Amino acid sequence: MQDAFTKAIVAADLRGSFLSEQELNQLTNLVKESNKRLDAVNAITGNAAEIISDAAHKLFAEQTDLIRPGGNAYPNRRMAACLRDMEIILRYVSYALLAGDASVLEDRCLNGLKETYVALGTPTRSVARAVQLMKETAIGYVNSPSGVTRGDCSALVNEAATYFDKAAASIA
Template identity: 75%
Template structure:
C-alpha cells in the first residue's frame, strides 16, 4: 500500500509542479499538493527522506529534458531551469 501511495503522490507532485510552472506561482503546488503531505507520510510510517530522493530524481529528469539540445526550444533556458528546480526543491523540502 505504501509503495502505491508514494508512486501516486509522485505523479501528483509532478503534475502540480507543471501547474506551478505554467502559472509562474507556487501557491497551487503548496495549496493543492504539499500542505499536509509530510504528516501523511509520517502517519503511514513512510520515510519522508526517501520521498524527497524520488522528488530529486524527477527534478534531475525534468531539468535534463529542458536542457536537451535536441529539444524544440533553442536558446538560454537557465531561468526556466532555475524556476523548475525551485518548485522541485520546494516539494522535496515539504516531505523531508
C-alpha cells in the same frame, strides 16, 4: 489560486494602488518568455511517465529496504501508492512552471503532505529523495527536447528547480 499576475494584483491591492510601472514590466517580461515556458511545461507533460519511472528505478536502486518486507514500498499496493505519488508531484511542478507561482503546489499538495506521511509511517527522507530524482530528470528534459528553437532556458530551469526544492524541503 494564484498565478504570477494574480500575485502582483493582490500586492497592489493591499497598497490600494494601480500596478506599479515596476510590476508592470516584470509581468511584460513573463509574457516575453512565455513560449519558452510553454515548452518547459510541455517537456514535463510529454515525459511524465518516464520521469516517474526513471526516478523510481533509481530510488529503489539506492534504498533496497523499501522493497523488502517491512519496507514502505512493499507489497504491490504500497508501491502503487508511492509511484502514483511521484507522478503527482511531477505534474504539480509543471503546473507551477506555467502559473509562474508556487501557490497551487503549496496549497493543494505540499499543503498537508508532510503530516500525512509521518502518521502513515512513510519515510519522508525517502520521499524527499524521490522528488530530487524527479527534478534531475525533469530538468534534463526541459534542457534537451525535440526540435525546439535554440536559446537559453536556465531562468525557467531554475524556477522549476525551486518548485522541486520547495516540495523536497516541505516533506523531508
